[PDB]
Amino acid sequence: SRKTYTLTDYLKNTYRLKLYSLRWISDHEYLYKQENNILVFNAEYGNSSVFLENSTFDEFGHSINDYSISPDGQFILLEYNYVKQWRHSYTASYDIYDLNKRQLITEERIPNNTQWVTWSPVGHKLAYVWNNDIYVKIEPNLPSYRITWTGKEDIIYNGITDWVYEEEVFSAYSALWWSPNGTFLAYAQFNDTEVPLIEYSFYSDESLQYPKTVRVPYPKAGAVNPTVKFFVVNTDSLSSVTNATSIQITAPASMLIGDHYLCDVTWATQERISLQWLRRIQNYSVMDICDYDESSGRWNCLVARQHIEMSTTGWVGRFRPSEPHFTLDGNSFYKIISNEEGYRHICYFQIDKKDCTFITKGTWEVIGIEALTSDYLYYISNEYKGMPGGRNLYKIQLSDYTKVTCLSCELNPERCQYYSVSFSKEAKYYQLRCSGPGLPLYTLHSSVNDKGLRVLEDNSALDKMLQNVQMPSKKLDFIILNETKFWYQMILPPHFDKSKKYPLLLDVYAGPCSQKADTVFRLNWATYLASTENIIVASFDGRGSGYQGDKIMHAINRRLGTFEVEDQIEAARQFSKMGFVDNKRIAIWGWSYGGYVTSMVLGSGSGVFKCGIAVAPVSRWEYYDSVYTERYMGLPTPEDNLDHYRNSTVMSRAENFKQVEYLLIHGTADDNVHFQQSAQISKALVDVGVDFQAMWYTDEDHGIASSTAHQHIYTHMSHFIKQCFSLP
Numbered sequence: 241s242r243k244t245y246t247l248t249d250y251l252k253n254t255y256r257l258k259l260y261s262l263r264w265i266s267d268h269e270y271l272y273k274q275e276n277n278i279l280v281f282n283a284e285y286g287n288s289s290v291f292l293e294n295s296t297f298d299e300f301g302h303s304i305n306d307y308s309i310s311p312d313g314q315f316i317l318l319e320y321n322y323v324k325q326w327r328h329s330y331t332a333s334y335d336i337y338d339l340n341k342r343q344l345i346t347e348e349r350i351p352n353n354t355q356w357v358t359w360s361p362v363g364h365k366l367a368y369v370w371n372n373d374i375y376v377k378i379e380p381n382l383p384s385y386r387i388t389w390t391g392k393e394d395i396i397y398n399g400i401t402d403w404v405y406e407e408e409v410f411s412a413y414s415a416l417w418w419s420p421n422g423t424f425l426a427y428a429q430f431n432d433t434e435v436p437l438i439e440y441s442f443y444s445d446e447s448l449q450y451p452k453t454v455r456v457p458y459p460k461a462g463a464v465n466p467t468v469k470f471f472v473v474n475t476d477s478l479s480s481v482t483n484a485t486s487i488q489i490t491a492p493a494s495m496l497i498g499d500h501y502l503c504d505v506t507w508a509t510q511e512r513i514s515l516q517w518l519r520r521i522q523n524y525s526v527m528d529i530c531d532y533d534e535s536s537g538r539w540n541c542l543v544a545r546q547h548i549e550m551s552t553t554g555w556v557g558r559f560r561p562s563e564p565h566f567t568l569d570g571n572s573f574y575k576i577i578s579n580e581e582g583y584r585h586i587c588y589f590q591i592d593k594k595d596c597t598f599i600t601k602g603t604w605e606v607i608g609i610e611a612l613t614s615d616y617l618y619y620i621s622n623e624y625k626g627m628p629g630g631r632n633l634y635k636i637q638l639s640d641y642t643k644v645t646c647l648s649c650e651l652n653p654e655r656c657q658y659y660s661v662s663f664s665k666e667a668k669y670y671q672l673r674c675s676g677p678g679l680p681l682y683t684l685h686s687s688v689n690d691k692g693l694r695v696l697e698d699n700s701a702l703d704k705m706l707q708n709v710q711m712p713s714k715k716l717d718f719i720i721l722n723e724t725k726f727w728y729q730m731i732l733p734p735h736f737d738k739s740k741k742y743p744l745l746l747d748v749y750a751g752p753c754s755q756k757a758d759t760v761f762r763l764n765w766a767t768y769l770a771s772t773e774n775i776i777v778a779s780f781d782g783r784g785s786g787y788q789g790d791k792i793m794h795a796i797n798r799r800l801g802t803f804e805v806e807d808q809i810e811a812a813r814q815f816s817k818m819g820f821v822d823n824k825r826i827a828i829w830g831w832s833y834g835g836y837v838t839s840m841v842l843g844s845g846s847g848v849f850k851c852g853i854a855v856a857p858v859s860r861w862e863y864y865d866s867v868y869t870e871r872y873m874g875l876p877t878p879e880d881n882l883d884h885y886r887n888s889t890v891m892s893r894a895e896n897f898k899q900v901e902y903l904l905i906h907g908t909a910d911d912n913v914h915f916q917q918s919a920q921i922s923k924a925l926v927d928v929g930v931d932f933q934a935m936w937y938t939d940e941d942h943g944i945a946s947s948t949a950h951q952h953i954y955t956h957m958s959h960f961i962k963q964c965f966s967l968p
């Protein structure tokens with residue numbers, strides 16, 4: 241009974257998930273914005289104060305996008321004039337405020353059109369990047385020191401990533417790393433001199449007479465990559481008239497032999513840096529521990545300490561080699577690594593010793609290492625109840641690896657199966673964050689005697705609202721293929737009736753190490769289709785998917801377009817057998833990798849699906865980026881893997897589309913999956929006499945995220961699906 245979950249409720253966010261976004265500022269305290277105001281909270285006892293009132297800035301002149309307070313409390317960094325760039329990058333204007341004096345510091349100001357700014361870890365030093373160069377202020381009101389002079393637009397980047405490193409290597413614009421002390425400043429420099437440029441039209445506001453041509457350096461499969469060099473600088477010994485001296489750390493000989501990347505940069509102590517490097521053929525990678533030489537002011541990476549990590553059946557790490565977690569003294573670290581049996585588990589490496597020791601073991605995987613103390617290491621894993629799409633905080637006693645204890649598993653079993661965590665420095669307390677299957681739950685806990693301290697947010701409001709609407713439910717089970725277990729989730733219409741046959745939409749991503757089947761609670765498009773339109777929305781993690789070991793993950797190695805397409809079709813074959821699915825009305829849609837998969841499934845000729853939608857699909861792997869594609873496909877050359885590159889295109893299936901109803905959507909300023917890709921789909925479809933539907937979106941990128949265009953696509957897709965199923 242009641243009204244149902246509508247499209248408008250999704251589009252307009254009629255029902256809102258509250259979060260509790262804190263920021264640990266010490267081992268016992270943490271900032272939280274309680275109604276604009278900024279408060280500090282004491283984790284042990286729970287009291288708080290106002291730290292700063294927004295009324296402070298009422299007459300600042302610009303609206304403030306974000307703020308950053310220094311580690312030592314003395315200053316706050318105000319961010320405004322936010323112009324977004326790519327997924328992680330942006331530009332902005334920065335002012336600084338002295339909290340000890342009720343005033344904005346107004347001289348030697350951070351340049352305008354600054355690309356990035358970071359505090360040091362301790363104190364109030366600043367590093368920022370402007371015009372692709374690094375600058376350093378020992379103090380906020382003093383002049384900065386120029387560190388780099390090499391920086392050129394679109395060509396040489398110091399302290400910031402270029403397009404692929406942001407998107408594919410670091411997941412981050414920044415390429416600076418302060419030492420804990422804040423003494424040394426490490427950075428990386430990228431060279432995109434002969435990296436080819438992707439060009440596209442940006443039409444801009446109606447007022448713009450002549451469209452602009454956006455020109456971004458972007459390596460596609462097999463193309464010329466950027467290069468990299470690594471540098472470290474002693475910010476304590478800088479000078480006014482004399483140029484700062486950057487000391488270059490070089491890659492291992494086994495990297496310089498060809499094209500390589502820098503994938504990880506973790507400082508281990510005040511004078512020891514860990515560097516990780518990765519071959520353009522990404523089955524082999526080398527770590528470097530580099531200690532600073534007190535007297536000769538240099539940095540040495542002894543080859544005997546090099547820790548090689550290598551893959552025999554695929555690529556290294558899930559999306560890249562994992563980060564190392566170092567003990568305070570920095571003579572050893574912990575790391576997620578694939579074991580003898582192909583499952584990712586925590587390993588123990590002592591720095592001058594050969595191999596490593598697995599602490600954890602079993603038919604499940606560690607997702608992440610979350611905290612390390614003298615006594616305990618903390619990690620998330622999907623161990624509990626053998627559910628690959630569940631997540632929980634565990635702690636391993638480092639004196640007895642067989643003493644493992646679930647911290648989050650039995651807290652609230654029915655409501656809570658998907659945890660993430662946020663520890664104070666030194667890990668004296670942590671915030672638990674449950675995402676489902678129930679409404680999200682934010683608690684705080686104490687590590688001494690794993691004590692539950694305080695509920696922070698329980699989403700009780702939302703819970704009351706949602707008791708008032710015909711909400712759908714999620715099934716989360718598995719089916720068998722190849723005598724192997726594969727998990728799926730179905731969102732189910734209210735007042736579900738096994739004795740009736742419902743229409744079925746297949747929500748697909750299926751890119752390598754993905755997982756669309758899980759215990760997480762969402763308010764999304766699928767909620768609407770199920771709630772209001774009474775459509776079963778199904779997701780299925782088959783071959784290539786992630787968090788279930790490497791036998792499954794690497795099945796797709798050098799072979800994208802194969803099994804992970806075939807396994808979606810089988811899942812549908814199975815869902816129709818089930819006697820509550822109208823096999824005449826089975827659709828499929830997906831975004832990005834999802835839409836390359838949708839597209840492939842539609843052009844397979846299986847006859848299972850009536851129709852599908854592909855949004856910003858890939859269509860030819862040679863069109864996508866070098867780092868991601870080559871990780872799974874290798875090089876597109878006759879000596880490497882040219883043939884399956886050319887075999888796994890969407891265009892070469894055009895004819896089969898002649899059997900289905902297809903909707904094709906892409907944005908025109910997609911820097912990431914280029915409109916080129918859809919341009920080629922449509923043309924192949926046209927050259928063969930297939931009618932299909934299409935929709936472009938001016939000036940939208942891969943997220944198609946402007947709110948008008950978000951609302952638009954989901955209306956269009958709703959009409960499309962609704963009428964493909966004959967729904968009113």
Ligand SMILES: *[C@@H]1O[C@H](CO)[C@@H](O[C@@H]2O[C@H](CO)[C@@H](O)[C@H](O)[C@H]2NC(C)=O)[C@H](O)[C@H]1NC(C)=O
Nearest residue numbers: 269270279280281282283285286287288289290
């Ligand atoms: C938590 O409560 C205690 C008790 O009021 C606060 O401790 C006081 O804090 C300030 C320093 O910031 C001092 O002026 C007092 O002398 C402190 N008293 C004691 C007994 O410690 C503390 O500030 C509160 N913490 C928060 C988050 O507001």
Ligand SMILES: *[C@@H]1O[C@H](CO)[C@@H](O[C@@H]2O[C@H](CO)[C@@H](O)[C@H](O)[C@H]2NC(C)=O)[C@H](O)[C@H]1NC(C)=O
Nearest residue numbers: 521522523524550551552553554798874879880
């Ligand atoms: C990473 O990938 C390359 C390409 O698959 C592997 O090199 C191949 O090795 C096998 C040996 O059994 C040969 O049959 C292929 O002809 C080789 N091809 C190339 C292009 O070298 C390599 O084995 C992988 N590296 C690791 C460390 O396992």
Ligand SMILES: O=C([C@@H]1C[C@H](N2CCN(c3ncccn3)CC2)CN1)N1CCC(F)(F)C1
Nearest residue numbers: 407408559751832833834858864868912913
């Ligand atoms: O836009 C992208 C990629 C996807 C890729 N990310 C990497 C980080 N990811 C990730 N997932 C889980 C844990 C950590 N990282 C998900 C995929 C980065 N950019 N595409 C790759 C798949 C595509 F379909 F080809 C389009």
Ligand SMILES: *[C@@H]1O[C@H](CO)[C@@H](O)[C@H](O)[C@H]1NC(C)=O
Nearest residue numbers: 390395396431432433434467
């Ligand atoms: C960038 O790389 C090119 C190689 O084509 C090189 O000639 C140029 O010197 C490099 N720029 C710098 C400053 O490293």
